[PDB]
């Protein structure tokens, strides 16, 4: 199966890496927003809407690799090993769900339609040369 | 955060522990069934249930992780660990993946209460010595 | 005193002894089906039925003697006399419990005076030689 | 599970032991007064109260740790732990009887909302140290 | 600032340091006696009164320095230097929290101007040299 | 006893921590800040507020922790320890003081709700990467 995540929320995985990835906040960042702004209803027994149900599963998802990476560390007596899984996460995962968490926080905060005009807005202006580009970037609040 | 992933569904981790790890199929069965069922519905641009955007968020989180297992099996260089840390990936987070899968493709074809009562029906009858319990299990239709 | 833990729901120890113990589920099966059906409850704060106070004593003694073996394990330090207790229970009491559990959890699924008709059913059943018995046995179902 | 046992009775496990564990009587001469006060309704087939049904359980619970202990006296080679288990029980798992047998004993006596009020009266009086604390201790009726 | 914690409560410190050290229960027993009699309304989502607000602070602070304690004797190693912060804060600080939750509590279960009038009278009884003062003290009811 | 100083006043210890902690002010400067704007009503004795009441407590406690902190760096005979207590005690409970200290003094000035909001409004725009954020931050009045 070829599957996108973001094409039933209107987005696809090119729109989302048209931002550059410094941009995004840390998974430790994201997960503490998700829990700061949305902890009530993300362990609720109701489908608040499709966005909760994919933070729900990739949030599951990321505590599956930090409860191996510990498992790796603490069970198997093996830090080195434990350094190397972790250093893996972060080099080859850690983009994925950080565009994913951010996407799907943002789009529940600010609504998705602002999410998308954003991401267009705002890589059009990073890839404006500094001197051409207005010096207050593109903003949602 | 505790998050249960079933919780939205109706349902529990420890209700779906109920039925024998051993009972599941394979993850790549049942990943070819949600295939041979819903490709279309999968890979389209509409929400077309929870079950739909949970499925989408797992089979794409299970690429991930064999990405992560086939890495560790050539790239990890303490013999000790390496088998452990496949084994533990395959059949450990494995079986959360079959039981998720199962679930939620389950839920589809035979309706949400079905997969529910049948969950019950099945952990006593297969708990009920062979000796007690009657020949004919429980049957999903 | 001469106390019969089953002569006020209408049974004896002698009747519960007239099936084979090869019959009865494992303690841990029984309190996991425990948990499965009645969870909440048993927890709860109302006396449910008399089934249900049976149930809360004989679980939480259960609870008593793991705790014991567990503590004898880590807390001293003597595995070895862990397992000494551990083998003593299984073949000693292990039977009393499996009985007791599964009497009183099939009184509540089942009702107690089917539980009652299906306990003299199966005893004679197997008892009756290979040969001369039915294939199909007796089902509480 | 969590299971309180004093739960369904209005009470539970932090109110008993709000009581000190020296001023409970001994298991056997709590033994002695269930029998002298309520022997024929404890070997009766009716299921008088939940306070009875819960005492049948209790008392027939602690025959089987008495021969546990007697079995671990003569049976435990490890000179260390044998002495530390026999103590554990007598004491720790004795405590937990003395607690249930006096709250269901007491109760059926004096009155559950008696014995509750008389409970926390009593923790109350004993903890006042001797100068401040009434002459008259609160008394059981 | 010259701050007095008993001085919005009608109190002083002085008028607290009116009763003997010795009068006072341990830390342990008040905190037990917090929980036995209020521990629902002190977790509360609601301002139940001054003396709530007071006490909460109280139980956190004297909570902190025990965690310091335990970080002390398991995080750094040290039960060497555990002994002596113990030692420290119950010779310096112990009294001061044994006079304030006491005062909290007594005021919670008797009433603020009983407690008072409790105060001058108990004083006064205690300091009467034993052969003056009547046999039976004041007592707080 | 799992006690909450936040939650009587809306909030709680997790949307406290939303904040990172580098942006709360000094111990010293919340203390010279609350005698600045409150001395006359702190010393007074009139129960004005929970927050008042709440300050009080917490400014006593913190003058009791400075004296364990100025004992341990003279008394803490093993060098090792003692800066790693001065340390704890200085940063580690300095900042549930600072935490706490700012929302009460906060409170009184510009209101409990505008506090509250204030702290998510902030917890976002400091998590947020510079170039997705507004230039001018959220601001207390
Ligand atoms: C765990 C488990 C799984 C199934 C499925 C196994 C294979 C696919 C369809 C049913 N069943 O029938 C069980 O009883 C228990
Ligand atoms: C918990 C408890 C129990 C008793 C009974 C022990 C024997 C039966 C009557 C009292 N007493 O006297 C207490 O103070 C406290
Ligand atoms: C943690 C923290 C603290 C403050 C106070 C710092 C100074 C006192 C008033 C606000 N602010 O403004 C933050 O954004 C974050």
Redesign the interface.
């Known amino acids: 199966?070829?599957?996108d995540?973001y094409?039933?929320?209107?987005a696809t995985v090119e729109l989302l890496s048209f931002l550059p990835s410094?941009?995004?906040?840390s998974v430790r960042?994201?997960?503490?927003?998700?829990?700061?702004?949305y902890?009530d209803a993300?362990?609720?027994?109701?489908?608040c809407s499709?966005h909760?149900?994919?933070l729900?599963?990739?949030?599951?998802?990321w505590?599956?690799?930090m409860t191996?990476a510990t498992?790796?560390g603490t069970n198997?007596e093996?830090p080195?090993?434990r350094d190397?899984?972790v250093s893996?996460?972060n080099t080859?995962?850690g983009l994925?769900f950080r565009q994913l968490l951010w996407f799907h926080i943002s789009c529940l905060?600010f609504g998705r339609e602002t999410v998308l005009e954003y991401l267009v807005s705002?890589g059009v202006w990073?890839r404006t040369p500094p001197a051409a580009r207005p010096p207050?970037?593109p903003?949602?609040?």
């Open positions: 199966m070829d599957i995540p094409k039933e929320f209107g410094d941009f995004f906040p960042d994201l997960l503490d927003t998700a829990a700061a702004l902890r993300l362990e609720s027994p109701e489908h499709p909760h149900t994919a729900r599963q990739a949030i599951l998802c505590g599956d690799l191996l498992w790796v198997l093996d080195a090993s190397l899984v893996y996460v080859n995962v994925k905060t705002f990073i207050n970037a903003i949602l609040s």
